[PDB]
Amino acid sequence: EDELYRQSLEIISRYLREQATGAKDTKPMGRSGATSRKALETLRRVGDGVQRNHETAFQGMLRKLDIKNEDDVKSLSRVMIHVFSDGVTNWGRIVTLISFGAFVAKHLKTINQESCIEPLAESITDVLVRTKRDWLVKQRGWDGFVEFFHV
Ligand SMILES: O=C(O)[C@H](O)c1ccc2c(c1)N(CC1CCC1)C[C@@]1(CCCc3cc(Cl)ccc31)CO2
């Protein structure tokens, strides 16, 4: 099918959900689980740092987007394409894309619109994979992501 898309969605979906609920999903990973597990660990370390280092900017952009419902959540894909896709690609910007998504995911829980988190993860994945596949493939995908941030 599309293994890069499938793996990307599982990783992003899980990180967003875990960020919003504060609990880990004990369900096993699908294909390429070992890598996905390392990718999630990486996001918990780096993504979490991003949300703090840029807390003020993140809080400001969130207020800007004024997210209250499903229509508002749907409006985010155009903004992601405008800001993320139309720019240089490097792991740092991909981490910001996902980190702000988690920031939004937490917001969705506060306003009791939790059922929008999964659709949101899907939208982030679409933007990332469908507009930056060449780069991702060249950078060795998630294996490369894990390698890049290795400590
Ligand atoms: O190039 C830049 O400026 C940065 O490097 C950069 C890179 C990616 C990126 C953003 C910035 N942003 C903007 C920043 C300002 C505080 C968050 C969030 C983004 C756009 C809004 C909507 C949206 C909604 C969701 Cl669910 C996720 C990501 C995003 C698009 O992802």
Architecture overview:
This protein is mainly α and 151 residues long. The chain has a single domain (1-149), classed as Apoptosis Regulator Bcl-x (Orthogonal Bundle), CATH 1.10.437.10. It is 77% helix and 0% strand. Helix 1 crosses helix 7, helix 2 packs across helix 8 (141-148) and helix 6 packs antiparallel against helix 7 (117-138). It is globular. It starts with a helix and ends with a helix. The structure holds the ligand O=C(O)[C@H](O)c1ccc2c(c1)N(CC1CCC1)C[C@@]1(CCCc3cc(Cl)ccc31)CO2. Residues 57-58, 61, 76, 79-80, 83-84, 87, 93, 96-97, 100-101, 104, 120, 124 line the site of the ligand O=C(O)[C@H](O)c1ccc2c(c1)N(CC1CCC1)C[C@@]1(CCCc3cc(Cl)ccc31)CO2. A motif (BH2) lies at residues 134-149. There is a cross-link at residues 24, 27 (Glycyl lysine isopeptide (Lys-Gly) (interchain with G-Cter in ubiquitin)).
